[PDB]
Ligand binder design. Sequence first.
Ligand SMILES: NC(=O)C1=CN([C@@H]2O[C@H](COP(=O)(O)OP(=O)(O)OC[C@H]3O[C@@H](n4cnc5c(N)ncnc54)[C@H](OP(=O)(O)O)[C@@H]3O)[C@@H](O)[C@H]2O)C=CC1
Ligand code: SF4
Ligand SMILES: [Zn+2]
Lengths: 112, 385, 198, 83, 178, 114, 43, 118, 339, 95
Amino acid sequence: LKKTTGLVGLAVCDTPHERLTILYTKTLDILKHFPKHAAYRKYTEQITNEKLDMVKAEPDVKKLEALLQGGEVEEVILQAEKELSLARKMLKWKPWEPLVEEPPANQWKWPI
Amino acid sequence: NMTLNFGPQHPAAHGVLRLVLELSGEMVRKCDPHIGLLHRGTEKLIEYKTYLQALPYFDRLDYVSMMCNEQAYSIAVEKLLNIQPPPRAQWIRVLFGEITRILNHIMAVTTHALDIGAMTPFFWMFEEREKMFEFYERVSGARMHAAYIRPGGVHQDLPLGLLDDIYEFSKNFSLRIDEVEEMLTNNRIWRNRTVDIGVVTAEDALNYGFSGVMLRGSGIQWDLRKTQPYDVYDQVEFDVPIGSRGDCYDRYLCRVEEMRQSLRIIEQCLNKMPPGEIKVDDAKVSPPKRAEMKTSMESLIHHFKLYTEGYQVPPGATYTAIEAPKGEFGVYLVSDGSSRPYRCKIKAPGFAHLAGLDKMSKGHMLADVVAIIGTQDIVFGEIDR
Amino acid sequence: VRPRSDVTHKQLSAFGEYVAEILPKYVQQVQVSCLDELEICIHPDGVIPTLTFLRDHTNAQFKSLADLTAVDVPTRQNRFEIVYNLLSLRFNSRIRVKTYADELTPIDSIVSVHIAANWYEREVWDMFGVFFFNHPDLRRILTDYGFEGHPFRKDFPLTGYVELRYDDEVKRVVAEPVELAQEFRKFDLNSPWEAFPA
Amino acid sequence: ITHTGQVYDEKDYRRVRFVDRQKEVNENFAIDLIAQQPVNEVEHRIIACDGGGGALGHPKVYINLDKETKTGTCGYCGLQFKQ
Amino acid sequence: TYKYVNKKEQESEVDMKSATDNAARILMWTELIRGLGMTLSYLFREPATINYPFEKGPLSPRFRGEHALRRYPSGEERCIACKLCEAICPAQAITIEAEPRADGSRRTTRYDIDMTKCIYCGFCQEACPVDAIVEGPNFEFSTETHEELLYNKEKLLNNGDKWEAEIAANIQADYLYR
Amino acid sequence: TSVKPIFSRDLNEAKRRVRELYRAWYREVPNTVHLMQLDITVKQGRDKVREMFMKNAHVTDPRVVDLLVIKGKMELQETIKVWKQRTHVMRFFHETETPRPKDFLSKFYMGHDP
Amino acid sequence: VKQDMPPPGGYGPIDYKRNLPRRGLSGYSMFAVGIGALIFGYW
Amino acid sequence: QLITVDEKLDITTLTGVPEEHIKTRKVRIFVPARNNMQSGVNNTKKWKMEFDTRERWENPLMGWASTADPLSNMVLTFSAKEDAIAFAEKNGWSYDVEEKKVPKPKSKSYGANFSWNK
Amino acid sequence: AVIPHGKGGRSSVSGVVATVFGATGFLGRYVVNHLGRMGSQVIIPYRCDVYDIMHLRLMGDLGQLTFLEWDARDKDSIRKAVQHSNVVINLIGREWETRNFDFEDVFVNIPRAIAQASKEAGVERFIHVSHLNASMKSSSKSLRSKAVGEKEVRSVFPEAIIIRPSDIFGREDRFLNHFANYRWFLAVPLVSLGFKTVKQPVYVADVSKGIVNATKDPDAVGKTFAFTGPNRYLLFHLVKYIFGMTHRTFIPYPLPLFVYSWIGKLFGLSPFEPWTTKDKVERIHISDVMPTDLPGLEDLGVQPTPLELKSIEVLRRHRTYRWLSSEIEETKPAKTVNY
Amino acid sequence: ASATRVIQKLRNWASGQDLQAKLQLRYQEIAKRTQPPPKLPVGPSHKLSNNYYCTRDGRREVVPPSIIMSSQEKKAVTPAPPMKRWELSKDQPYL
Ligand SMILES: NC(=O)C1=CN([C@@H]2O[C@H](COP(=O)(O)OP(=O)(O)OC[C@H]3O[C@@H](n4cnc5c(N)ncnc54)[C@H](OP(=O)(O)O)[C@@H]3O)[C@@H](O)[C@H]2O)C=CC1
Ligand code: SF4
Ligand SMILES: [Zn+2]
């Protein structure tokens, strides 16, 4: 429909709503393994669910671009799978855990 | 891929760049730029100097954009002190901030052509440059390396008459840009050597931290001057020249377009510069006027302490970035309560751009490498610092 | 007196909490300066994880690395304070993530997270001596090819220990221990009187 | 020779520097040039020497010409004034 | 506000007339001829160069140029060795040591500006309370030997005496501004 | 105590790496003396390598050793991938500088502060 | 009082946009010239 | 897993200092006193360690002071005595710490000056 | 005097103010190098235009090297040069008797006037340099004339050190380059086929360091040191060795000297610096004298440096691209002759 | 300037522009030197009253950074409001 996105490298993705719905539903799935009260799971699930809901609700891509911001729809696709990649990465990282180690004392005292 | 060690051959210059390269005949397989041929210690030297005596270092960091760099340190030192410059000084800094952008673009576009082989554009626009320098001199005293924009505003009000001349020039400069155009924008040959050379994707440009025309040329819309306004660049109205099909030719067109847009910003500044003072009234930060220091005791004490010891900035750290002509110029200035800084990493739009030379010039000929160093406006002072 | 909007000191503050919550395993302190700048502080092990979350999170996209630097507080056990300043072109905000590294306790490299860091990390090794694991090609960038010592360390003499001159006898440039003809006059500038409670 | 009696000894070798060259010195010496200017006979106990030219001169200072014996001398110009 | 440079708004479908116009552009190098016209045009413009020795590029009063030490009209050198010109010099160029002169006045026994060290910032011009050290107009002081560039009090005082008339005029023009 | 290992878990494993670097330099000395047309003897140079590798013989800590070879490897790279020209290499030999005596009487006769 | 300021009423307007003039002979007409030279030249 | 080392962090081998200036340089850790000229005490707060002073011969051509010692102008500032001692040990410089000496409390009261018999 | 302060390198002071009249020379260049390195005050009297002495400027530090215009025939020029020097070193010498200067002048006449003035001045010590094996009866006018000088100057300046170097080995020297340059000549004549003229070269630096050490040592007064070398050589190996490093064919063909003195006469006629000299020829085949004398090197503090060690640097320019990378190890050494 | 009309006409044509109207060389249009003396304005803080510095010294009224999350339902929050799309220019959208 559009001829091309402003960003040089990005290429127009036809069926953008379908591509987003695929990525958004996947992320939601991966997040399902995160610990229940894990902060990343609750926060990202909230963001992704709102994004899908809007993608499901809006059948016009131009208004879809306005509703979840994202500039061009193609970028939103890149951001979603980038997040999908990190969600997979953090499950391995287990950052929801407590602080690895307290800072050596006086480590953060700037006046010095 | 016989290493040629090209660049100590003064072939693209912009400073002294040993671009060790491996070339299968006339094709470049890998470019490993070497840097530090101009490292001079600017970051360590500053730790041993007071805030006002480190201002002259910033002009030398990237001296084709002499002042715009000074504004970045100014802003940074003003933030740490939570002081702001007076209204007239702000407009001045935007006036000379833009004049400086033109000066940089005339350098970048014309020096680009000299390496390409077009030599007449350089002489055409260096005469215009010359005329601009004279503004610097009649405002600061130095043709370049002024030291005019200080941490609390400008040093001295504009001479009585400069604005009028920064008009006559501006009123005409356009035609000069127009001429260059009739020689290069559509040359049947400029396009070839520039078009589709060093294309950088949008995602890759953000990833390698390009942050400049280089991003804007790829179509990413980011001008720190519109996104995060500094000084009174908010009160003016200009159009960022975004580009598509980012390549050497497109970005060029962008640099010619900001030369055009800066004339739009300069016009306004001349039309709307306010009556007022050009330096903060806090003798604490700005040095007292010489009539005052020669008649009032509190002013001498403030003059003596300011020049001998210093501002005494409150302890803290800040990263302030402006839109220097090359790209995002930022100073991370950590500061103890002392009058002399503790650290001052200068982010140079250029350390990031050079790094990209490798990911831009791939499967390219020796001549292509020369074109790409030009499209990054590399001034080795900022990269080497 | 500069104009300050508390809208930002509130927005940024909240984000700080958001990051902290999402990455509690590494975030030690998260502060907003009086200058409206956030500065999450992370354990050195959280270099990879905290950056990646910021580069690839819908509610916090921090795509470009503005700078990687290392202040050196000699007093601090962990001498260096690697500081990474990032920008989010999507949310028009910058954040700084700063970690601590001692001389012989290397930090991970983020060239993976941002390739901008390929050069700055080499710059930090050359000047301060911090080492970055998994770096593609770590090697001196700014200093001379044979330079010995890391220059921006606070314990390195400004003038340095070696200077170069051309010697006819050997017809080649030759280092010699530095001999300066007017030593750097070290003006003492600190005043014996404080300014405010701070 | 110079303002401060800087005269390389007959045996010093920096005199080689002056060999085949002029040792730069100024005939006009201040210690003497100020003397020529006469004492200003002001009629007020305390007078001020702005330095001549106001802003184009030296920091303003007030001199007490009360001592009848001596004359006040501006720490800046060296100009002397007597009551 | 943004602006697309090099973005083709639409796909103009080739029309013979259009094609010919284009083909002619490639075949008969029409745009190349356009570029030649521009340079021929200037060939006819008056050249902007100046006879350097005979004519000089204009420098206004604030030009920093070469250091000089001024003297009071009476003949007493202005410097009173407060030594903050040394304090604020960014390059460590000025070296000053002083002692009370026989008159009892304060004066500098040695004032040495190392011009090779100096980066001509003009802060010394700024800092001096008596304004004894000034940035003199002369920029032509190129020297055969490095030692000549190092300047002691006698060279600067002599430089001051030679250029005092113009220095006074220059300071006269710019002091209201400062 | 309680330190984290940089690359070598113990002086033993670390020493392995030093051996490798020595070999590297040993095999390289000859090439440099030829590709840089240096006026030195391969044997002479190879002794220099030994000198340096032992100047730091005292280090007992594994972490310090590991960095030392990282740095050492970097130097080799600058000399085999030649980015370091003769001036740089010969500096190792301290050819121009006048050697200073370490005898007390010698120093007394020459310098205020020994 | 007297400081360097924009003249009353503001300065005049300055042009910044490209003023490159699309001046040339139309392509068909152009071809004819060269073709005519050849056509005549051959005769 | 972490490894154990009882070796005092000495990193003299990595710092990159010429041998002469690591074995012949004595640094003193001291809290700066107050020039009696001023009564402010903000410069007597942080500990500083300063390297031993060395030759300052006059220069023949201009009479400027000339120094051959690189570590002369370097004075590092450390917040606490323990941290400064650590810097000397790992860098291998010899140290001789001087205990801080703070003014002892002094009892003052304006009434005394008007004492019947002082 | 000047108390010696500093660490020992440039920008330091050693307290030796020294006129050095023939500094522009091959030996000279080296003498100024060490004197400048040490931090000594060096006055360089020069006659050639400034362009040619630029090579001496970077040596020494600012205000440490002073250049004075001087003419040998004009006594006044020598007078002012030594006015403020306390050490005078004389390296005045040439191989080709020039139109306006005879071997006497360059060796005996001039070097006398110089030391003569130096005394009038009150210079603490004068070092006079004369060629090795210099009999007042030696065949080469040069050597004999030089001998004549070392005597005279002793009467103008008593207790004046007289170092007497052998032909010198160094880059830019003749001894080594001359032979190597015989390449242009297809055949390389060698009197007695390069035999019975054993020669002991000495590295230039060794000579220089030695000379400098003299200036700063009380042990040398009236001493006639002889810097010689670390190994002697029959001219045959030397010639071939040279050609060896130069990697150019060696074709030793004997040439009767009586005829060869004539060849020297030929080039000698050359207006522009004759390449060979009748007086040279003799000198070249003049056998090196034995080493029984006030020792020079080592005695004055520098251990001689073998020829083979640095030969590679002196003879490299004469090789061809093909052999440029070749190194000393690849090549063979020459053989000494304790004879 | 000072060009015979014909040269000017050739100039204007070959260039395609009225270069005469905007000559690069400057002639009697540049600000004359010795412009009149300047009496510059004194800014605020020069009042002789109600000018207490304590009420005008932002330098050190600044305080140590505010600290959150020190080591010693809830909605998602962004670094800041998502950025607003820039709008195409209206004087010259393209070119
Ligand atoms: N192989 C050797 O070099 C040996 C040398 N010596 C002795 O050592 C001394 C230095 O030798 P070397 O450096 O090779 O000699 P050079 O041929 O290099 O000349 C030495 C210097 O003498 C100066 N000089 C020569 N003639 C005159 C003159 N008529 N008037 C003024 N100055 C003059 C030259 O100055 P300019 O060029 O400006 O005229 C030159 O700088 C010689 O005197 C020689 O007798 C002894 C044994 C071996
Ligand atoms: S400031 Fe002016 S007066 Fe004070 S010393 Fe420097 S020069 Fe002499
Ligand atoms: Zn006075």
